[PDB]
Amino acid sequence: TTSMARNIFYGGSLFFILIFVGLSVHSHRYIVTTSTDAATLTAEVEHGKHLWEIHGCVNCHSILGEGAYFAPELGNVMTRWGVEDDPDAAFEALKGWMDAMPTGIEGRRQMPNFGLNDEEYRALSDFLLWTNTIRNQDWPPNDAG
């Protein structure tokens, strides 16, 4: 029955690819129009994502529960800091933290300093904020990340 098993495979696979591509096209639109705010996805937020990327935060941190497991989830850091509805306080809170790293503390995990200017801190602050608003099924469970 080998040529059958082949045909189940070639054919039944093709079936599920289609369903997947259909499903993805739906999901792509759900993301763009409903679950993330396009209007708030400003030039700063892009520049923030880019900064996020080039300094390699993801390889210490996680964002929406994806990344590394070495440092706090930052997908909701702004809520954790009671600062989510205030863009200026967020910027302030982030700059204060990053300026302080590395702690240097013995026995404690260490974050680098990237030599970031204030335009840049703003970019990151705005992006982490914008991330905090992504409608993602009530994850995480609480404020602790």
Binding site: E66, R109, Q137, P141
Partner: protein, 445 residues
């Protein structure tokens, strides 16, 4: 050897094994930084070491597959490879690419540069010149082996292998699409990671495992190739929609909680398929094959992939549990055992099979090779137990109780020392395998 071009595989394996030794040493270092956080905390920060641990993993596994393809194709296609020159130029591109990556990450060369500096998403941090290199290398590779099958005998092994390999290559192209929208970014990111590891790579694992069992047991084509197509059917049926287990909490629609959670559970089927395939073929077939070691890695592969990918996969795949365990040390435990059983062991099994043939001599260093398996598998599962405990303590302490990340991590220090210790075993294990393969000596009794 039946065909003289099959010796290209030996150069590939050589480099891949070189890179394997860097990969686990990168791991050991990461482990040590966990228990001793101040170490090299300014010259080599964690995220740098990590990129190196993860990329050298992707790169060496691929070189393993490429090597294995250059060994297994001529044998099944009953002809010599279309062009040795392409194979070597391919591998030279790879080595150049992998060098650039090491040197860019370490010294932070050309920070920011669109083409020369590092990018920044998990496993896709390679400067874009390197990503381009990989695609050029992959295409060359795909052309080369494809021509060799076109002009020779086609079999089920060769077909599954070419599909998996072609699918693998083309899905890499998504690594170029980096949308300014985090949710979209995350959605297409899994096209690479998951449709590799649970999609295309699964074909490659099954077709190479087919070819292995074929040669070590002596059961005939029709029994092997039936089971082959069945196994890869169940894989793609469950694997593709099962992508949804990565689509719970990233901003994709709620419906993925159902699709994803259901098709995820079905993913344990192919990994059970392969484990049983391997075990029956053995029981069922000739049992006096001299290559005792390539046998052990082969069963080892299919077994640990089942416990690693299958069970530990299932454990945190249902959104009810995943809500809590997502992005946690539990994740780290699945990933290590899954990667080890499905792909490391599989490359090591095929290395153990082809080394003697390639050197034209008898299966050698069998006791050593096998001791490397127990030491790597031993240490690897112990690591995954220890990170499960740790991830449970974390999940509870931070995700139910709500305690803050850093504080909770002070609670699991003991588990991190235990992982580091278990790491010593894996590294010693991996070096010994390299030794066993690289330096034939008088056999142990």
């Amino acid at each position: 050897m039946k065909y003289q071009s099959q010796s290209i595989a030996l150069v590939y394996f050589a480099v891949a094994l070189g890179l394997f030794a860097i990969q686990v040493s990168g791991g050991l270092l990461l482990g040590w930084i966990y228990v001793s956080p101040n170490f090299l905390s300014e010259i080599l920060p964690f995220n740098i070491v990590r990129m190196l641990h993860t990329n050298s993993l992707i790169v060496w596994l691929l070189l393993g597959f490429m090597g294995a393809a250059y060994f297994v194709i001529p044998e099944e296609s009953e002809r010599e490879i279309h062009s040795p020159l392409l194979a070597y130029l391919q591998l030279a591109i790879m080595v150049l690419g992998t060098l650039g990556v090491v040197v860019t990450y370490l010294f932070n060369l050309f920070e920011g540069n669109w083409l020369l500096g590092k990018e920044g998403r998990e496993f896709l941090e390679q400067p874009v010149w390197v990503k381009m290199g990989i695609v050029v290398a992959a295409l060359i590779f795909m052309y080369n082996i494809s021509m060799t099958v076109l002009q020779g005998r086609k079999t089920a092994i060769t077909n599954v292998l070419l599909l998996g390999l072609w699918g693998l290559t083309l899905l890499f192209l998504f690594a170029f699409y980096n949308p300014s929208n985090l949710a979209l970014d995350k959605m297409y990111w899994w096209y690479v990671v998951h449709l590799w590891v649970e999609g295309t790579w699964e074909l490659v694992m099954a077709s190479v495992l087919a070819f292995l069992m074929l040669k070590l047991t002596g059961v005939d084509r029709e029994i092997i190739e039936k089971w082959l197509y069945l196994i890869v059917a169940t894989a793609l049926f469950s694997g593709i929609l099962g992508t949804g287990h990565h689509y719970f909490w990233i901003g994709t629609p709620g419906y993925w909680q159902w699709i994803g959670s259901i098709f995820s559970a079905l993913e344990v089927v192919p990994f059970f398929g392969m484990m049983a395939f391997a075990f029956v073929m053995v029981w069922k077939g000739r049992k006096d094959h001299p290559n005792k070691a390539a046998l052990l890695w082969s069963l080892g592969c299919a077994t640990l992939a089942f416990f690693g990918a299958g069970v530990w996969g299932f454990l945190h795949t249902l959104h009810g549990i995943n809500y809590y365990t997502h992005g946690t040390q539990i994740t780290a435990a699945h990933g290590h055992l899954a990667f080890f059983g499905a792909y490391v062991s599989l490359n090591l099994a095929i290395f153990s099979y082809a080394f003697p043939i390639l050197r034209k001599r008898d299966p050698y260093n069998q006791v050593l090779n096998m001791a490397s398996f127990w030491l790597m598998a031993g240490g690897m599962t112990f690591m995954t137990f220890v990170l499960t405990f740790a991830g449970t303590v974390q999940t509870h302490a931070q995700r139910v109780q709500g305690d803050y990340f850093m504080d909770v991590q002070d609670a699991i220090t003991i588990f991190y020392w235990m992982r580091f210790g278990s790491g010593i075993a894996v590294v010693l294990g991996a070096l010994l395998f390299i030794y066993a393969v690289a330096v034939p000596r008088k056999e142990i009794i």
